[PDB]
User: What shape does this take?
Amino acid sequence: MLTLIQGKKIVNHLRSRLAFEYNGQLIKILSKNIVAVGSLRREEKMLNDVDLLIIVPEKKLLKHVLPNIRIKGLSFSVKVCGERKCVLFIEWEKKTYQLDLFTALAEEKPYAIFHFTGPVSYLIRIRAALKKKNYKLNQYGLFKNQTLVPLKITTEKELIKELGFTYRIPKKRL
Assistant: This one.
C-alpha cells in the first residue's frame, strides 16, 4: 500500500545503496546497470510489488552477483532463479516489500525490460508478427533471415527497432 513516488524513492535509493561482496571485493550496483521495471514502468497511483532490471557484465559475475548482498541501512533477501529470474524482498523496521529482479547480461538490458513489462501476450503477438517477417526474439538473441543475431541497441525503443516492430509504452502492458 504505497504511492507511485513511494516505489520510485524505494527503488531509487535501493539501486543506489545496493552492494554485494564477492571474493572479498565489493560490487556496488547503481542505476548505471540497474533499471526499475514493472510498477516503475507503469507509474500508477498505488503499487504493491516493484520489479528491477540488473544487467551483469559477465555470466560468471551473474552467478556470483548475489554472494554477500547487502544494503546501507535497509534489509532484504536475495533469491536466485534460472533464466534472468531473481526474486528478492526488502525489509525496513519489521516491514516487507516484494521486489522482482531480472538477471540479464550487459547486452540483455533492452530485451530485459521488454520481457518484464509484457505480459508475454504482446511478446506472443510480436513474436508471431515478427515470425511473419521472418524475425524472432529470444533472451539469447533474435533470429533474422534464418541467422542468429544478438540484440545490440540502446533502449527499448531501439530494441523494438532491433526487431522491426512498433514502439509502445510499458504502462500499456499487453
Notes: The helical segments are 4-16, 39-42, 59-63, 109-117, 120-132, 156-163. The two ends are 24 Å apart (CA to CA). The domain at 106-174 is CATH 3.30.210.10 (Beta Polymerase; domain 3).
